[PDB]
Write a protein that binds this ligand. Structure first.
Ligand SMILES: *Cc1cc2c(nc3c(=O)[nH]c(=O)nc-3n2C[C@H](O)[C@H](O)[C@H](O)COP(=O)(O)OP(=O)(O)OC[C@H]2O[C@@H](n3cnc4c(N)ncnc43)[C@H](O)[C@@H]2O)c(*)c1C
Ligand SMILES: *Cc1cc2c(nc3c(=O)[nH]c(=O)nc-3n2C[C@H](O)[C@H](O)[C@H](O)COP(=O)(O)OP(=O)(O)OC[C@H]2O[C@@H](n3cnc4c(N)ncnc43)[C@H](O)[C@@H]2O)c(*)c1C
Lengths: 493, 493
């Protein structure tokens, strides 16, 4: 059943934290709905009484969107996690409170199916889907939103009336706009999503629920490279080769689209760089492409990696390559920035990166992660979904995590220093339409709002949404005219 | 709904692996029941046709019990994971397919409750509960079976008729025996459990559902000690002090029972030892006991630890200290042995341990884990439940994990060499009734069946069940007269 957790309830303390402990969520109360109807009734009460609301699914927000500005009510959606066949026609319905782990297990166990969900199994569908969603399978399957068929969402009209509407991929008029806005517009903007329905493009769909087939086996490999064996020149060589491989091998449908690499380029205090690579073993039984990719990175250089891994079944291999809600990632303070890369950075940029990775800094959880991108993602056009980046080949995440609030300035300083110098030639940000193509709204970065940090002249909304912002604003005016749903980086009326 | 996965189904490959990849589970088919009735109907069809059956919940078995001897049918129970208030009107019912993670989240989120479930969140309730179940909260709350109120189980009688029976803590006669047998008898022995109901002893129970209250906050700390700073003498000193602290401070109800330590005493190739400690912050707001305990271990020695951690809310803190189904623990081959310690080992034993931790061996996932024990566990008498160890103060797990089948012998050899020399004075095993008290059935060790490995004259069933074995055999004869449920270490008729 549905229940409420107030300020005096002992569970409030746990609920007041999302994953990123830099931020706190302190409403007058949390409501934990059990059904979409519970969501509607809860929102209706709140909006009628003029109370401020927000929702939360997995709590993975990189920013303080849920708890800031101060809310009277937060709807925590984790009980809405049902997964099942879609009521009408093929496809699959997923409650917005389901986590990636729950979805991956259900899709595989029930239908031998897979969607391109991310590498962190605790992420909630709510925010992940609304912002686009990419993962290890995206070079084969595209973005999660590329499989979206419908969104069921609680919305608030100009008369303060809450309705549960369902917008479908084949809708036109206002409903068509609401559907499109959820294909990358980002969470916290239009209403409270209660469920998503997924139906894959014809060329990716298989029986019996119209989703893609999970690979029978995956090659999975993790290679550790000791920093002690790497000098600046070989670092630049390895990094350049990583990017150049992607420039060549990121076309939709190519054999190389079966491979996905994640390069953890760690601060030197970690002692090592770590390359993870996976490849669909159905496509390439011997894993030849993976082996050639890995070997090519360090050939000639004096750098020798220590590999581990093997060939695993799908669910076991996926978990081997994933990050769950356990251990040192829990209860941490963190900051992350993002960039889309259309082409290799210059060698000078790679030297800047090397220099900051050797700064005197407590960097045991500080790194830049470079992920393969493109492939099937790049089959669609920039305006087909709200996500506009459809010709990038590597996606980077720039990350630091730490424990003590007293070190916030230190860690934010290191991250900002690195990102801003790396992109100094373009105002300290990865501007669109050049070697880079802006940023990903699921790694939101409030520094992009500040002229001291962003001297590019390109506003946050263009870095995240490019030319799709106008249509998003129209959808916002139409569907959330009172700006009921808002946060520091919400779509403007 | 319920479905079957046969040899030709692509999902069969994933299902053929449990957590420990040393073993394979290859039945003619897996059946995935959705309800207890599905279990009964599936078992009935199988036993009528003379087909061999076994079940699996979380897949965490340390041995090959599920897939060996060859089975015609394996019932995979993960869909039976419902959690809710007991129908009787008091307590909570938990499906046997629920994992520790599912149970911890549900108990906390719904009722601010907690049970002493283990430190690995992917373990299934099915096997965990039947074998006893201990965890970080056991010094306050006892074993999981100490909270068991009922077991709902599918059993097979002499006429090959399957019936779903519910045996309760207040039952007498045959049902009383069936209930008692599930309080430590171990999984795979009596029938297929479909659900457990939990109701805490009066002194531990709270509103609203008769379970214990989850602590408001936990002190959590992880301390890393570099092997480079530790010589044999200081190693022995640290280990001795760890054990002596527990000899003094493991009485039921003491302030020190709010503390739980896990000491990962790693092979030298890992470079470090790691001590984890948590303490109930409601009991000890300043965490003085924790701070004193940690300081005492290395006082005098030249060993300096590097601490991290803090004070966290219950669910976040529990996850911070826990191991989930992700990363390097996935897809691995492993072997584990166990021992109950009633008193400190001799310094000579601790020197043996030191020597093997320095052996030329690939030991990056080889370690001995020492866990705080006793406290509330030790309130009950040895015959009150099927678990007989009720006066131990430290529990150890002796572990190695690796990837390649070709190294099975190497790793088994290292682990056997260490355990057998450490316990050489008592036949190579932790005999009962001395400095040690035998072994834990949830870390089953088939080596205890071989005279080359066990020269103590104490058979496996006495090491695990001591004087409770006779009553277990009687229950087995009564409730599984055809030996439908059996494996390499199952209770004998
Ligand atoms: C922490 C983390 C995030 C990751 C990780 N790995 C990713 C990957 O491999 N691929 C990716 O595409 N993204 C990865 N991400 C990022 C997540 O995609 C984002 O952090 C998501 O936005 C998280 O979603 P969720 O966990 O639901 O976050 P919340 O904090 O609950 O909400 C974020 C934001 O969205 C709004 N919102 C949530 N739910 C709804 C619904 N139901 N309807 C409307 N709006 C919703 C919130 O109010 C808030 O505004 C790996 C890691 C470790
Ligand atoms: C892998 C692993 C195990 C751990 C870990 N941490 C523990 C902890 O902190 N405290 C503990 O008390 N135990 C810990 N364990 C050990 C687990 O407790 C044992 O490994 C359990 O037996 C695992 O249970 P489960 O995951 O359900 O294992 P299975 O392999 O499915 O079954 C084992 C055994 O039991 C029978 N069985 C399962 N289900 C039932 C039902 N419903 N009814 C009767 N019999 C059942 C199986 O047939 C098999 O014989 C940490 C880690 C990483």
């Amino acid at each position: 059943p549905p229940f409420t957790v107030g300020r005096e309830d002992p569970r409030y303390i746990e609920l007041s934290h999302s994953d990123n402990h830099r931020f706190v969520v302190e409403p007058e109360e949390f409501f934990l709905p059990a059904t979409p109807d519970d969501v509607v009734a809860s929102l209706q009460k709140a909006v009628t009484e003029g109370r401020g609301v927000a929702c939360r699914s997995g709590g993975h927000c990189g920013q303080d969107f849920v708890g800031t500005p101060r809310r009277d009510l937060v709807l925590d959606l984790h009980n809405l996690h049902a997964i099942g066949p879609a009521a009408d026609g093929a496809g699959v319905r997923v409650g917005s409170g389901a986590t990636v782990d729950q979805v991956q297990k259900a899709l595989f166990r029930r239908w031998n199916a897979a969607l391109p969900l991310g590498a962190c199994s605790a992420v909630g569908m709510g925010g992940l889907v609304a912002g686009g969603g990419y993962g290890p399978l995206s070079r084969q399957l595209g973005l999660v939103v590329d499989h979206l068929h419908a969104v069921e969402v609680a919305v608030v009209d100009e008369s303060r009336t809450v309705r549960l509407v369902t917008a479908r991929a084949d809708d036109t008029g206002d409903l068509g706009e609401l559907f499109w806005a959820h294909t990358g517009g980002g969470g916290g903007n239009f209403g409270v999503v209660t469920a998503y329905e997924f139906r894959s493009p014809e060329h990716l769909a298989t029986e019996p629920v119209g989703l893609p087939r999970a690979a029978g086996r995956l090659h999975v490999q993790k290679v550790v490279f000791p920093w002690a064996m790497i000098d600046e020149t070989s670092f630049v060589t390895v990094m350049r080769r990583f990017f150049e491989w992607h420039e060549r091998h990121s076309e939709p449908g190519s054999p190389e689209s079966s491979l996905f690499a994640t390069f953890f380029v760690n601060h030197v205090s970690s002692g090592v760089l770590q390359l993870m690579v996976q490849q669909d073993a159905d496509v390439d039984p011997e894993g030849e492409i993976l082996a050639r990719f890995v070997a090519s990175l360090t050939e000639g250089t004096g750098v020798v990696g220590i590999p581990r891994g093997g060939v695993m079944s799908w669910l076991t291999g996926t978990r081997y390559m994933s990050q769950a809600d356990c251990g040192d990632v829990m209860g941490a303070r963190s900051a992350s920035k993002s960039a889309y890369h259309r082409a290799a950075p210059t060698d000078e940029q790679l030297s800047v990166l090397h220099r900051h990775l050797h700064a005197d800094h407590p960097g045991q959880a500080s790194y830049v992660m470079f992920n393969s991108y493109g492939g099937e993602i790049n089959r669609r056009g920039p305006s087909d979904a709200a996500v506009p980046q459809r010709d990038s080949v590597v996606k980077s995440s720039w990350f630091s995590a730490w424990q003590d609030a007293e070190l916030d300035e230190l860690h934010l300083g290191w991250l900002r220093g690195l990102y801003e110098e790396f992109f100094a030639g373009t105002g300290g940000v990865p501007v669109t339409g050049g070697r880079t193509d802006g940023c990903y709204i699921n790694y939101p970065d409030a520094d992009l709002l500040d002229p001291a940090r962003n001297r590019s002249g390109e506003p946050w909304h263009h870095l995240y949404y490019k030319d799709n912002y106008a249509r998003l604003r129209s959808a916002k005016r139409a569907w959330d005219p009172l700006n009921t749903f808002h946060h520091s980086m919400s779509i403007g009326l």
